[PDB]
Structure 1
Amino acid sequence: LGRKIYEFYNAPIVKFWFYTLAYIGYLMLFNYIVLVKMERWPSTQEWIVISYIFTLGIEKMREILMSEPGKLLQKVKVWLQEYWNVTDLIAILLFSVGMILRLQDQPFRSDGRVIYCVNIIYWYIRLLDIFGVNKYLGPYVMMIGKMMIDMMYFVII
């Protein structure tokens, strides 16, 4: 029975859906902490959000430190050749910066709330990757991808 639970929890489909449910949990909790206030110290669900981001940073760190090249700069470079992974690093750094601005007193609470207001924009646009798996949403995402370039040249015009 223990082997059955172990085989179920190491299947990639289970890891996918199980990460996705925790990610939906993240999005609802982070919605709650951005619509409702902040205080001198963070609320409990905001601390949950901070632990999400911190352990995500640690996971990205071992993604750096368990790649196939053996020279560390090559590990960092190959890890930074994927666009979504680059913006993941960028977002973790602004969310940390927003944390340091949030912990410092007024007028820094407002700027921390601004940074956490930009983070919900990025952490809903992160969903397009995962979406690119469903048989109907994937071509839609790829159209948005090419429409970036086409709409960009239309912005110049």
Structure 2
Amino acid sequence: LGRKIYEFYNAPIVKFWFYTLAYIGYLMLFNYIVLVKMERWPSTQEWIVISYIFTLGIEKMREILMSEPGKLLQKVKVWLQEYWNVTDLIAILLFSVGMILRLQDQPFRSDGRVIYCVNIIYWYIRLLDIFGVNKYLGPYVMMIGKMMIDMMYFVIIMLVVLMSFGVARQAILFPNEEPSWKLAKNIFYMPYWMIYGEVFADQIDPPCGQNETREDGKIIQLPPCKTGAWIVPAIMACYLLVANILLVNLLIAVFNNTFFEVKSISNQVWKFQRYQLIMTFHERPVLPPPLIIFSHMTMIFQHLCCRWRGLKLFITDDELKKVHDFEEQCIEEYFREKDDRFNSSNDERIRVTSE
């Protein structure tokens, strides 16, 4: 029974499901601490969350120490190849900064709250990353990573057109404001939400230079038209049409042909990343992040007590000889089959008949 529970807990699928259940529990714990009061001292849920983050950082430092290259500068490079790993390190450092701000008094505790909120943001994406184990969701995450570049090109061209209209609208209706940093917010605020529904029908073409009626029948003298402000509805119409219709449907067509590119791959890149998932969840210790401290102390005790005082199967010389002979038989068969297929092709028959 003990060897049975050891075999069950050492499997990579069991370790992966344990890891994702611990991650989901940690994420709901994070949600609960970020939605409720945080007093002068942190609560139990916050202690669980900081314990998770610190043990995850210690686990990443452990994998840095136990990497395959021997040169220590090469380990951090071969770990910096993966984007998730460096963003994980960035978020762990951000959580440490937010904790050291929150543990002080006011006003830094609110800044710790902001850091905690942007850390939710990141850990929800990391949950999106974790979903890539499925043979349908993993390809979808891959496609989203492919479409991010077309998103960036849309961001550039929209940015040009949108803030062009923003500068024009901010400088036609508003000729009488001092230099202040709110001008950039006014440039980027009103034209951005036009794409996504609401078009600010109250804030466009107001009746100026006219005593419009108030609620109680009193014609109040409205401010006059400062400039020829009939221009801004027309360039509004042009911008809305060109922006929405043109570039949205352009990126619709772009996403269609890029999906045509990535659907022919589909499951193959999922089977490719399956090996990386296999090796990461086989190298990882049995206990999940919240309780990986137990595994760290028992591996420290094992490697400083009984030592300091995977797919790689070892093969003997005779079995190596059998494997080699099987290999030569295989390549020779393959080349005989290739030559027979080439001689059985139609064009070779036509050529030899002509000769």
TM-score (norm 2): 0.44
Residue pair 1:30, 1:120 contacting (<8 A) in 2 also: yes
Residue of structure 2 in register with 1:13 after alignment: 13
RMSD: 0.7
Structure 1 stretches of 4+ with a deviation exceeding 4 A read: none
Q: C-alpha displacement at 1:98, in angstroms? A: 0.4
- In the TM superposition, what is the alpha-carbon distance from 1:51 to its structure 2 partner? 0.3
Q: Distance in 2 between matches of 1:146 and 1:118?
A: 24
2:105 is paired with a residue of what secondary structure?
A: coil
1:63 touches 1:79 (CA, 8 Å); kept in 2? Answer: no
CA distance in 2, matches of 1:110, 1:130: 30
Shift of 1:66: 0.4
Identity %: 100
Q: CA deviation at 1:135?
A: 1.5
For 1:72 and 1:139, locate their aligned partners in 2 and report how far apart those are by CA, in whole Å.
34
In the TM superposition, residue 146 of structure 1 has moved relative to its aligned partner by: 1.1
Give CA deviations for 1:78-133 in whole Å, capped at 9, x if unaligned.
11110000100000000000000010100001000000000000001012322122
Equivalences, count: 157
Question: Radius of gyration: which is bigger?
Answer: 2
The worse-fitting range, judged by mean Cα deviation, of 124-133 and 22-31 is 124-133
Give the whole-Å Cα distance in 2 for the aligned partners of 1:32 and 1:132.
26
Match of 2:43 in 1: 43
The CA distance in 1 between the partners of 2:81 and 2:128, in whole Å, is 18
> Which fold has the larger relative contact order, with Cα–Cα distance below 8 Å and residues 6 or more apart in sequence?
2
Q: Counterpart of 1:2?
A: 2
SS at match of 2:136: coil
Cα deviation for residue 147 of structure 1 reads 1.5
Q: Distance in 1 between matches of 2:2 and 2:83?
A: 39
Tell me the distance in 1 between the aligned counterparts of 2:57 and 2:156.
37
What is the deviation of 1:71? 1.1
Q: Distance in 1 between matches of 2:127 and 2:66?
A: 25
Q: What secondary structure is seen at the aligned counterpart in 1 of 2:135? A: coil
Q: What are structure 1's unaligned runs of at least 5 residues?
A: none
Q: Render the CA deviation track for 1:18-42: whole Å, top value 9, x for unaligned.
A: 0111101001100000000100010
Counterpart Cα distance in 2 of 1:127 and 1:141: 11
TM-score (norm 1): 0.98
Tell me by how many angstroms 1:155 deviates. 0.6
SS at match of 2:134: coil
Mapped to 2, the partners of 1:142 and 1:79 lie a distance apart of 20
Counterpart CA distance in 1 for 2:98 and 2:151 is 31
> What is the rounded CA distance, in whole Å, between the counterparts of 2:149 and 2:133 in structure 1?
22
